Amino acid sequence: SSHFSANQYKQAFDSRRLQNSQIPQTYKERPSSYEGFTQIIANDRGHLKQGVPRSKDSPWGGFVGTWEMPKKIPGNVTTYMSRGDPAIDNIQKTRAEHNEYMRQAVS
């Protein structure tokens, strides 16, 4: 669940030149540094103990299937130029509504 970069070897190990032309999964490269010792924050079962902060995301990840994807996809325009102001408002509105639909499907 991490890559932590490869310094010199960023010529390879990107998805586009690894013959994966889809959208990359972004990780946290340039790993950080700690001072030493960790809190145990878990029992012998893998459970998070009482008191620790827990993510509000779904424990099964987010994968919106074909039959629960929204029937409308925005368009991936990311330009907002030479459009009318109602057109830009329409694109922003449908982007917000479809992001809300994906968040509904995830959680």
Add this chain to the structure above:
Amino acid sequence: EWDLYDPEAKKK
């Protein structure tokens, strides 16, 4: 097991 799923089994 070709006799079980031969496409011409019921023909032949």
Add this chain to the structure above:
Amino acid sequence: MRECISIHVGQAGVQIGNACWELYCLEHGIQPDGQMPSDKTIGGGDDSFNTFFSETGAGKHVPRAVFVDLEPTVVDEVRTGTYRQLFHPEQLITGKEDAANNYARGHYTIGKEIVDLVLDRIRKLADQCTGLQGFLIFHSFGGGTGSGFASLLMERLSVDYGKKSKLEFAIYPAPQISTAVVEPYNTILTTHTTLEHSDCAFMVDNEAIYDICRRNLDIERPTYTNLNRLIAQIVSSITASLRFDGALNVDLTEFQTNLVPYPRIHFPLATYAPVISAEKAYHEQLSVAEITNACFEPANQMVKCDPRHGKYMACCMLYRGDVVPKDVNAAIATIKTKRTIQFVDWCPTGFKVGINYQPPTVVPGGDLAKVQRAVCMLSNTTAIAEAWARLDHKFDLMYAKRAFVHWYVGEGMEEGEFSEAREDLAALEKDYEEVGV
């Protein structure tokens, strides 16, 4: 390195794919069983086929195509045809029921049945490709698989692959020739869906290619085979520079940049010259200036839309053969000095020229004569607003009485998509008139 994944959706798309893959096999010297003709010496140890045909370790050249149709036959005809050994068995995808000229069936109920499988095949082909130039989607706006499932596949491809180039070949509905009644409904809905999920959608139509076959080739019974052969020649002249040596090289990712001025104006025309028969090729000189004038003549068009009524916004000229750039510049400057051809004031530099050394390929048993030079001309006139007006008038004519709507309602779409589709096309027409003025 050059990779084009060719998706043929619909019965029209699959038949055009048959023609184009016959043409590419002939051009790269691949037999219909998918092998070099028992020799590795034609072209030497070449790998120029890599743009279309994936190659295994034994000599089998499997193509990079996905043939999709919900109905059986046609795809099963490819399965049991002469090109049976060439195509991979999972490359040809077939459903049980037919979309039955219904955008709702193609987009919501039956189209979503196979879309995960088609995307899985496209994903495997893309992972096999060593760097995609883009997708080539062949379909028709007539309705069903070529409309609803084509729009759905484009929408999901825009979800998954992001900013990947998608070049479209659409059989646009003819102005008066029609083989269905819900062609305006399907065309309006498909265009509304694929305004944002598209890059550059080349248009052809059967009526203008019929007129071309009747006038030039002198064929009194042009079937779909001849139509698909000219469409195959068009797409081959489009993709020739990725696989043949040329003086000016053009790739698949420049047709959006040099032909789409504004993000909704992405519906270019298509022309091929010289479309000629043998007895007329014996008479005609077929020089560079002659074919260059023949491209801009408003009778060689394949979209059945007179470009004198509109203004040219961009052009992409694709010369192939023993054509010289000096005469190319001379002819394309005489066209600019000509007054019949009229350009928009905001595009002085309105041409993209690409010259390839490879002469055009003559199919055996074909109808085109053997020529040494050819031009594939790719215009972006605003004359197509006439066709949009005629289509929108037909849509409103059947929509005021709300005819044929209950099929779409019962198969999974409400009146809101109809209304916003007509609104989007009216906005598109206003955009065309604004970019014209």
Add this chain to the structure above:
Amino acid sequence: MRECISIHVGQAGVQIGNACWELYCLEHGIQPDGQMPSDKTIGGGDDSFNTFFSETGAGKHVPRAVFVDLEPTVVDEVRTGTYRQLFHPEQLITGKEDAANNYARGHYTIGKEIVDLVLDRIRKLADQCTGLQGFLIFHSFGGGTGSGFASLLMERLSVDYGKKSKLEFAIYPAPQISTAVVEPYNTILTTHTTLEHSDCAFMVDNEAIYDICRRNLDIERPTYTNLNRLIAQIVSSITASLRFDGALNVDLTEFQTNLVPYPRIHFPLATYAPVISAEKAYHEQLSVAEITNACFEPANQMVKCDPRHGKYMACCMLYRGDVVPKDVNAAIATIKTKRTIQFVDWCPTGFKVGINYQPPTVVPGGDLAKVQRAVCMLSNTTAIAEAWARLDHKFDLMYAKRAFVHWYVGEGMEEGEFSEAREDLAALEKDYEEVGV
């Protein structure tokens, strides 16, 4: 030295053991009767068979297996089959009556008379071998001896062996199809009593292998022999590093420590790639990247579940044949950059890869194509919480109305055992949910 005793329990275990030992004898060159075929390797000792075979003074190779069924039908078929001379007679003990799909009957009343004999035979087979790696125990959760007697066997093996590995190959019940009706009871009970006594339980669910044979192998009506051959190929790819030379050797003790994060979660999923047939393997090459993508594809797992709806804990990739570590690294890195594959946050590094040079062995008359290379993936992921919750709901629907409980009550078992088993699987579902946060 790298010895592995295989204990096959039940009809399912005996039949998959038949297929496994056919594959083992074929790949080690053993004739079915008892010996090497005379002139084959006269000077070469070729002592790679010592993992699964022992040498006597008569020059007969004797397998290190124990076949147990409480019904003398499948064991009698083995004793009268083609491999009637391969097996030692005391390695195939059998009972007089079967459990007839009853955990209580197979564990408490008629499973107490075969347990002493099977532990005596296991003791003899362990004292005969020097350096035991672990027990490969092949059985089914469907009920009877595979759920009761196998669990009693693990309970005794925990007492008298301890730290030795106990790799289960367990037939998991299908989401839809079924043979018995009290198998939810049998599965819940056997899972409750094997959670703290096994080490790593590979799920080899039958419905997914049915659809795999229907999809990749083009078999309209697959059968138990085909599924047994696939499971035999799975276990051969698992154990091949103990017999053949390999670049990255993996033993039985690495699978537990690399696939079991917590002592409750020890149920990984096996899958194979490619499982393509010959007429389609002719069409395209099967490289390391393609077989890795085939393993990570959702419609190739040998359990009917979608791993995209869960989160991976840890994957094991056993590459087998003509594979290279750089293509392995490139494939795994491409998988990690893919978006549809998501790992759990506490496992930053989450693969265990073993490269082996021996190609897969082809059984004559089989269905799998001959390939240069293949890969067995053993993935531990949270996606099987669907299977656990569905099976638990099937248990609850029957235990609400006390259906089929009087059999277990009469055959020496209290309903407190049922209550504790249900509570234990509740805790298991809570663990599987709580891991993913």
Add this chain to the structure above:
Amino acid sequence: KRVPHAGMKTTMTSSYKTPSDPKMTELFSCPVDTPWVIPEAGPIQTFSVPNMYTTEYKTYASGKPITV
């Protein structure tokens, strides 16, 4: 009595046939041979220049007058 020539003969199987034609040679090779041979530039062509590859330093202590 089914008609013999147009009775059962599908359009694709009658049109998209396997390619076979005696004129496949002209598709990839011209029957007209090339009317030249061209060698590289030679020493008699690069040394036909009068006083070639010599500079003005070579007229010192040479004994010949400068007509160049």
Add this chain to the structure above:
Amino acid sequence: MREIVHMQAGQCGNQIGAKFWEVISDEHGIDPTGTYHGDSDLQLERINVYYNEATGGKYVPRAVLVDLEPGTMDSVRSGPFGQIFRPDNFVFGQSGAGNNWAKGHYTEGAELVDSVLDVVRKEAESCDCLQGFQLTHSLGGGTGSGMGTLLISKIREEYPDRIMNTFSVVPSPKVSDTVVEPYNATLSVHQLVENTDETYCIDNEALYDICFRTLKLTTPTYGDLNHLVSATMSGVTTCLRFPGQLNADLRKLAVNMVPFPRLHFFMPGFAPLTSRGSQQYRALTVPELTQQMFDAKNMMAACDPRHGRYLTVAAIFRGRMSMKEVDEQMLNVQNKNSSYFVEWIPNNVKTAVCDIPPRGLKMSATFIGNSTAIQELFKRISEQFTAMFRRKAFLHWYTGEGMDEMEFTEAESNMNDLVSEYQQYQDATAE
């Protein structure tokens, strides 16, 4: 030991530079396999200006081939004189910017500049003097304009004082060959003005006119165009590469060319040029060499020098001649054409003479000129830019790849200031 690092980017770059290498190799006696089959030691004395010594007689060119898409680079490495280049000097991408300055400058082109600068740094610190870098790029394209100007900017930051010579194939007055070439040309010349110290503007229509009029040639093909351009690349380096009566390297040429830092756009020229059957009418001499140089026909730009005023002009002669004859010819040209030269600079002609001519020719001459007629080219590009920019056409393709309108406005104003500077120095009087 003034080394020169060569850089060919884009399709036009990878064609023109390949022709340049196969016309330099014949002058220096390098065969297609890379060995030295030379006639005199003068070819081998200064071979380190363009080549690195290898095992045996092998000499590998110091060229970097940059492209975001294979293609014409495969064609030039599969053609003749393509196996002499080192395989590590072939930095290629996989997508291609493709007539998009934004895509070539601020996208996947920018994740190749690390490898290109690694190769350039290797070939640069494998030197001792390092006169300069030269680029062969193609204003009007995606990977020629954008990526090329990005390389120019980065290498100018790394090496400020060294020469940054560029050969720019500028857009044409008639015929476009690219729809977005005003945008690409403006956005590239904005970088060129601030970064490069000398830039030679070659125009394809001018090459067509020369090949069609001075050379007839019926069917020219791009090989002859690249040969003309390559001959003028060799004409400005022949003083470094061979001894002469009056040497002038690239820095001497720059100093005697540019009067002000923002006037580094020259119009090159090579004028021993006859037709096929026209050797019998022109017995080549210094006076007709000079009038063929100063003729408007044999100028490789659409800018007519009669529609302007020659600020400065340099002439690199090669071959055997008299310095009195050369200087009298240039004085006679200046004295006859007084109004076509600026009156506040006397003797606008900088002459250099090399003893070694190109092979075949008895003697040759290279013409380069800083004139005020290049304001016509920049004004045409400004006119087309302000035609395309008022309606925001073909501009979402840049702003979606990630730039803003402020860069276009700044580039337009910079090129307008360039036009204004050329105009005010055209009509400036002495007193």
Add this chain to the structure above:
Amino acid sequence: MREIVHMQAGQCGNQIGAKFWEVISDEHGIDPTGTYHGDSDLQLERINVYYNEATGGKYVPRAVLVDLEPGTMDSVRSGPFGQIFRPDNFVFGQSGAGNNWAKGHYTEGAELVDSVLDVVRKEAESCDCLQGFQLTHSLGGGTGSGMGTLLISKIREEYPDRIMNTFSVVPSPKVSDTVVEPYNATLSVHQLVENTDETYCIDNEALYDICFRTLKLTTPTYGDLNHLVSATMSGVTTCLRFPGQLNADLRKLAVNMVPFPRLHFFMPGFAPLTSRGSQQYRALTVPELTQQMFDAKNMMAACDPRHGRYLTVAAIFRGRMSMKEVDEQMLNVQNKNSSYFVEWIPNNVKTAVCDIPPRGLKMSATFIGNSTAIQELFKRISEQFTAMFRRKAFLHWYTGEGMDEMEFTEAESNMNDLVSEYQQYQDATAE
């Protein structure tokens, strides 16, 4: 006559050391049977360093082979050059650690370290000078890490003054190769810091890119990977075996690099590296050799010395060359890349030169670096360790093999302290 004893632990150690004995038998002329068939007497002239002499012409290696299963040593024995090892030096158990550091260090490796120690003590008292020990293993396995570190601890208890070398195949940033690598590496580095004199951290991914980009080679195979590692060891050790103009043994190397006792983690590098078909374009000079050394892509670890700062650099030129070219190239690379060099150590490069290049090579060069950039590797390992130890991933194996959690906390604290001192000496200034 200074002897060193070689130990291999685990699968990686066994294969890498088998290839190492193969290459150093090839360069000394030892045939697989064990006799001598060398050309010159210099091959056997210092044969006592790595080989003990049996009766007759048999030259057994000074090697100890440890793995908890017969396994990989079975493959090595039934491979080429596997009959030279003494059968009494194969020390093995029955169970085999399942990539468990606790099993390799406390349970399974506990009742085999006595036999390994008796073998090592015998084979070391058979020596005459006993310069030191070198061990090949990985920090990602069960018996490679745990048993190897136990061996290191016991050997440092036995002989506290001898030189200790470890070759430490570290976990890779990309791919996994084992899922319990953070635990194994954190538990092994905590032992390597306080018990090893010098450590060459070697990365599979860095070796992959070295073998596949700078050598092409398509399918690289662990034979070539382990041979690159073995070539680095030979270049390290060569001053014991062959004469030179300026020799440097292991103690000179360790004194001239290691500034402070807990900073002995190095990055190796072997820098003749020619791709297939580029030797014709290769120039084969001392500056090119030094440039191929001091390139970041040529390191055998994932860490970037351009991101970090070099503390001490050791360069051994194994072959015939000039003190001019060597010393001036070291001075030039330092003075150009003074940013990637600590200012408080003036001229922080040790130079050694041998006289015998590899067979089939004119000159070779091994590179050892002690940059502060290697803290990135420990940061990666420590962060993955935190991510696992927060949720107690795979910890029940380590706790059930009789080992507590304060061992994990102490190991993590020691690694974080190591990163702290590396960063401190990176950002510390001169004055």
